Write an enzyme that holds these catalytic residues in place. Structure first.
Site, PDB file in Angstrom:
ATOM      1  CG  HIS A 187       0.496   0.002  -9.261  1.00 52.61           C
ATOM      2  ND1 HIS A 187       0.133  -1.132  -9.623  1.00 52.61           N
ATOM      3  CD2 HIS A 187       0.661   0.482 -10.651  1.00 52.61           C
ATOM      4  CE1 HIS A 187      -0.029  -1.497 -10.852  1.00 52.61           C
ATOM      5  NE2 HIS A 187       0.194  -0.288 -11.388  1.00 52.61           N
TER       6      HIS A 187
ATOM      7  CG  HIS B 246      -2.174  -0.332  -0.067  1.00 54.11           C
ATOM      8  ND1 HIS B 246      -3.232  -0.935  -0.237  1.00 54.11           N
ATOM      9  CD2 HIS B 246      -2.453   0.748  -0.661  1.00 54.11           C
ATOM     10  CE1 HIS B 246      -4.196  -0.586  -0.330  1.00 54.11           C
ATOM     11  NE2 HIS B 246      -3.885   0.648  -1.000  1.00 54.11           N
TER      12      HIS B 246
ATOM     13  CG  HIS C 294      -2.017   5.252  -1.688  1.00 53.54           C
ATOM     14  ND1 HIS C 294      -2.110   5.042  -3.113  1.00 53.54           N
ATOM     15  CD2 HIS C 294      -2.773   4.646  -1.045  1.00 53.54           C
ATOM     16  CE1 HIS C 294      -2.762   4.173  -3.179  1.00 53.54           C
ATOM     17  NE2 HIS C 294      -3.196   3.655  -2.031  1.00 53.54           N
TER      18      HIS C 294
ATOM     19  CD  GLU D 211      -4.650   7.295  -2.628  1.00 54.46           C
ATOM     20  OE1 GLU D 211      -5.366   6.304  -2.202  1.00 54.46           O
ATOM     21  OE2 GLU D 211      -4.264   7.134  -3.977  1.00 54.46           O
TER      22      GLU D 211
ATOM     23  CG  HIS E 149      -5.824   3.211   1.691  1.00 56.03           C
ATOM     24  ND1 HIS E 149      -5.720   3.534   0.498  1.00 56.03           N
ATOM     25  CD2 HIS E 149      -6.071   4.238   2.514  1.00 56.03           C
ATOM     26  CE1 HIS E 149      -5.849   4.804   0.347  1.00 56.03           C
ATOM     27  NE2 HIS E 149      -6.087   5.377   1.708  1.00 56.03           N
TER      28      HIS E 149
ATOM     29  CB  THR F 270      -7.702   5.184  -4.165  1.00 60.37           C
ATOM     30  OG1 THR F 270      -6.722   4.286  -3.851  1.00 60.37           O
ATOM     31  CG2 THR F 270      -8.829   5.643  -3.176  1.00 60.37           C
TER      32      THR F 270
END
Length: 257
Positions: free
Chosen positions: A61, A91, A93, A103, A116, A195
């Site tokens: 992911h 991590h 996104h 996000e 994050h 999330t």
């Protein structure tokens, strides 16, 4: 299983994780004009001087940099938090294009990516217990824009070739997460959720006002990762972000005027 594709992406998650339609879901749009300045809020305390990174993992992911959280080595305190929250992982996104990837949004603006830093409340003893509590986690969220390089990110970028595909891990010791922090620790805060599935409503979000800048080359390297395992059909790991969810009965607070 869940992901970010046409048939398994965020709009589908509620079928396996009904809390996806819950009352305190993340991320959200941060409307800067309606966030409330709160003078009861304390400055954040970020104590990362003794951080012990262990490993970096492609989990299919995102990628996670994991830390030793068996002692108070890298902790977050203060701000809206009561007690001590230990860093367990960070991590990112990110997007397929520089104009999307974050996000959270700010006045509907999307950033190229979002970092994050995930911390859990030590009163609960371990991360697995913490995620079951409404005040279990504190996530420090930091926006990335594309501009000048971020030197403190480069060690992460370097190692990504070793974790291209789902399930690959690599030793990743002696990484200093302080090199990912902007100058200012001014923030917004609100109660929310993970999330990603399981989308548990256990997070005090602390989203920094000031983005960090990374280079075009650094983000491009993120976009060469793969969602798939080695020997499976290649699908680039891009656009691994959940869109903004309804604020519902929540007020975003600001540490700054």
């Amino acid at each position: 299983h869940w992901g970010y594709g046409k048939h398994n992406g965020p709009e589908h998650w509620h079928k396996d994780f009904p809390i996806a339609k819950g009352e305190r879901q993340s991320p959200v749009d941060i409307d800067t004009h309606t966030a409330k300045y709160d003078p009861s809020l304390k400055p954040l305390s970020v104590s990362y001087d003794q951080a012990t990174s262990l490993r970096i993992l492609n989990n299919g992911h995102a990628f996670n940099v994991e830390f030793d959280d068996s002692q108070d080595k890298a902790v977050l305190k203060g701000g809206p938090l009561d007690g001590t929250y230990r860093l367990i992982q960070f991590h990112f996104h990110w997007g397929s294009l520089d104009g999307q990837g974050s996000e959270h949004t700010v006045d509907k603006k999307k950033y190229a990516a979002e970092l994050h830093l995930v911390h859990w409340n030590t009163k609960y003893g371990d991360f697995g217990k913490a995620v079951q509590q409404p005040d279990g986690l504190a996530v420090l969220g930091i926006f990335l824009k594309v501009g000048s390089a971020k030197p403190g990110l480069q060690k992460v970028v370097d190692v990504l070739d070793s974790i291209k595909t789902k399930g690959k891990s690599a030793d990743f010791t002696n990484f200093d997460p302080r090199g990912l922090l902007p100058e200012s620790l001014d923030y917004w805060t609100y109660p929310g959720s993970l999330t990603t599935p399981p989308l548990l409503e256990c997070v005090t979000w602390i989203v920094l006002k000031e983005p960090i800048s990374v280079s075009s080359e650094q983000v491009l390297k993120f976009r060469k990762l793969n969602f798939n395992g080695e020997g499976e059909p290649e699908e680039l790991m891009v656009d691994n972000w959940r869109p903004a969810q309804p604020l519902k009965n929540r007020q975003i607070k600001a540490s700054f005027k």
